[PDB]
Symmetry: C3
Subunit: 313 residues, 3 copies
Amino acid sequence: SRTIGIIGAPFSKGQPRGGVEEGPTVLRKAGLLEKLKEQECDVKDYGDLPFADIPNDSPFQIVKNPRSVGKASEQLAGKVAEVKKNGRISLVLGGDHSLAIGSISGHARVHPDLGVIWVDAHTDINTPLTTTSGNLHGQPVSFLLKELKGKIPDVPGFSWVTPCISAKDIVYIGLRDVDPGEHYILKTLGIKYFSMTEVDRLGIGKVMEETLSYLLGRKKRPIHLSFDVDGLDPSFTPATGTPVVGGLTYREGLYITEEIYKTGLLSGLDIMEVNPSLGKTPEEVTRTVNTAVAITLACFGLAREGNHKPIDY
Amino acid sequence: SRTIGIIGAPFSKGQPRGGVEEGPTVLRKAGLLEKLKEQECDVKDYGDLPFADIPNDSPFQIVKNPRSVGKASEQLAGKVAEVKKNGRISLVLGGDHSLAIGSISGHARVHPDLGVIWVDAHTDINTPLTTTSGNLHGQPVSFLLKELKGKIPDVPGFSWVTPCISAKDIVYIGLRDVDPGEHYILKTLGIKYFSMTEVDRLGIGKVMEETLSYLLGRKKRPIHLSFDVDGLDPSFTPATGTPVVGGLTYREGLYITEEIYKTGLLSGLDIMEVNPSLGKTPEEVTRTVNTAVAITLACFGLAREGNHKPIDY
Amino acid sequence: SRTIGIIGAPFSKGQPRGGVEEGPTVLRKAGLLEKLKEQECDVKDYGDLPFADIPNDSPFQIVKNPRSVGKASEQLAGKVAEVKKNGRISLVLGGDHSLAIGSISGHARVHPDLGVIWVDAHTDINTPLTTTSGNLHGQPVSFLLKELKGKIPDVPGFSWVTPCISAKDIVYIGLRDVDPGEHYILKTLGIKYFSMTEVDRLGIGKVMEETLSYLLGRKKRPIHLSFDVDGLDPSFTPATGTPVVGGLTYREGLYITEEIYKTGLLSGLDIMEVNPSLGKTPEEVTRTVNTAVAITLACFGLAREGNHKPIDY
Ligand SMILES: N[C@@H](CCCC[B-](O)(O)O)C(=O)O
Ligand SMILES: N[C@@H](CCCC[B-](O)(O)O)C(=O)O
Ligand SMILES: N[C@@H](CCCC[B-](O)(O)O)C(=O)O
Ligand SMILES: [Zn+2]
Ligand SMILES: [Zn+2]
Ligand SMILES: [Zn+2]
Ligand SMILES: [Zn+2]
Ligand SMILES: [Zn+2]
Ligand SMILES: [Zn+2]
Ligand SMILES: [Zn+2]
Ligand SMILES: [Zn+2]
Ligand SMILES: [Zn+2]
Ligand SMILES: [Zn+2]
Ligand SMILES: [Zn+2]
Ligand SMILES: [Zn+2]
Ligand SMILES: [Zn+2]
Ligand SMILES: [Zn+2]
Ligand SMILES: [Zn+2]
């Protein structure tokens, strides 16, 4: 049926603030598994990946914690590939977005033809040479693009990496805080994106129609959804590291996911950047987690119009 | 002209929390009548219906306060039918939504051909046999549907009831918290609804165009609007019993009503679920009431673009 | 390139509450100039206009501080005309909206064929004879309309005024609190407007397309944008004198301005009604100013999708 495989990934060295390691814990203790089991979902939790501490991981130029991040993704890519072989949609509950490198890589090992939908207020496509922060949660995409392969230096811990996607297989939704170098890359590789500008102009309805018509226009390949919690407006998911105002509405958030689910092609999912310790109040924490959970459930069947199990009431 | 007849209905036994009995009081003391008189409106207040206490009203299966609710609606249906004969649009300031049974029944006694628009985060169409709460504010619609007549047991106090509407004469707007049994009924009787999903996809503009094209496609019959205050997002109407996040915008709220008014067919109106005691702060209370009032005024002429009385300024 | 000329106008006698005189100060101390210089913008600040105190300025009928306001606008019109001759887009950081009279008048002295976009929750088109408040921040438009010339009494201090625009050269966006006399004028002179009703119905996308198709349908004349901070919903710009609920979204706010900029015709800009002292909290103050700044930057190039300077990264 709608089989899922849960991958907790308590990692945070992809950026400065540490609380995101707890993301898996809080979402789990929010009742996610239970809630998913309450749907036609066949759920199997593969546990929280144990991330060995790499004490010796000095900066690579300005790129911070490279070996730590590379291993974290290298380990995850393998676990992802495992559940995908067990015929389950991989659900990655993580910390920072840098894990996307491991998530998508391993997912591709199984389904190379996959298409990606990246919901985020940022493009996370900086390169070790374009980034000015050195924080890897803002560079995952660059490591995954084939077009870029050959303009990215060998970063300690990323030798295991192989560019599993071309510009033509990814769509962004939500952008509102993009770097100049990031912008240049977009227009140059002609990447499909819908910034808040396009959403405002078109409506989330058209936005979703086009994005899917874009990725599934030709063949009907498996879908990977990388959802960075900061894609939604801070008034919904405040407990996040890099929030930007003017974000996606809670309703738009649900609309995106309700539509992905209805395609029947959701192969992989990432719920990133949920940092409970950045909530200025116990409720901002609750609010953030709750939304993260609601969005996840929509990915797996939950519909605002209602749902009904096969029987005469 | 635009003649109104005010019906205060301080009832609450349609659900557990009691504060909704005060709804009429707070809205009145908010200046509603005055404000309506300030428009081209001819206003007549029929007073707050006195609801006899039914001390002996044990549960019917799991259905709570059946005799209390049935009488409350039985009395109201008669008062509604009275003002409709006095050629005035009935305005029902109430408590819980279970009163809809009395409101619509009596309205129909006068205008049997009426169509209904139900703004609510819920469908309130459970049956004594489908409800799991037993609270009647979530079952009014089931008692009014002809298609369902014959699948509803005789509930103490509802013998006076007669199904005055078919599936084809009602439209829902706002749904986002629907029960499985409720969902089955929708798809089965093919009821027209626009959940938050449809609103997100289409926009309130198209939503309103379709809903009216649906109800007034054929003849031009009188319109009944049942507005459950919880249809709007909690950030607008927090002082309500059953709030759900991801609701209708304040602007969408006004858009709905501004459009109904412009049809010139508004025959009956219900402003339900305003419970002032559920506001966590004196202002949430104020906010909730204010919105309830603003929406009501839009139903009777108030336009955001402005209004002008027939004369050269 | 994209040359700007900054005009600070610390005036407030266009309405009762005084804090708006500080608007220039707070926006400047928010880093505006710096931020604009950070873009392809060529910025020149002409300083804060010194507004002589007119101790003797008794009411004209009910019109308050007429001589004070007339001089303030008379002085500004001249400064505006100065920067427009220095080939720079005039940026007017002001106090109350009554300054629009001086801003647009002087802008026209240079570019008579200009078209105006007025973002505001009000039309500010009352006349000394229609206004019931007597506050001039709600009458600037009336003084600028040719069609009205001959139905406006000579107000002390406004002799220097000459109606530099006809009904056909202005578009309103955001209206939601319009006076009856104001409404009569609209329908009578057939002025193009998009109240919140139209925005709700059409979407900001269509709204912007139509408004520009309206003003630039024929020739391609310079554009004047009068942005009253209260056009946006109070949840964004609370520190304002006359706020009204159900306003423009922050995203819609940016959409409007991003679109104006992209036309390449922005000739003049007004950022009015930012009163820091009306913020119930230090953050409402911060929030309000921040939004005012973000909107201004969008007028001058800033795009949510990102920007890139001419070079290979
Ligand atoms: N563009 C910034 C912020 C990136 C934010 C990363 B993300 O999307 O995972 O939050 C940077 O490169 O440091
Ligand atoms: N579906 C729930 C909630 C109904 C809410 C009723 B209403 O719409 O009036 O608030 C129930 O049957 O108990
Ligand atoms: N219509 C009211 C309010 C006008 C508000 C002026 B404004 O738009 O500048 O805030 C009046 O004439 O006093
Ligand atoms: Zn495959
Ligand atoms: Zn992000
Ligand atoms: Zn991040
Ligand atoms: Zn370029
Ligand atoms: Zn990200
Ligand atoms: Zn009739
Ligand atoms: Zn409800
Ligand atoms: Zn209720
Ligand atoms: Zn079915
Ligand atoms: Zn209801
Ligand atoms: Zn010109
Ligand atoms: Zn205004
Ligand atoms: Zn003002
Ligand atoms: Zn008229
Ligand atoms: Zn104004």
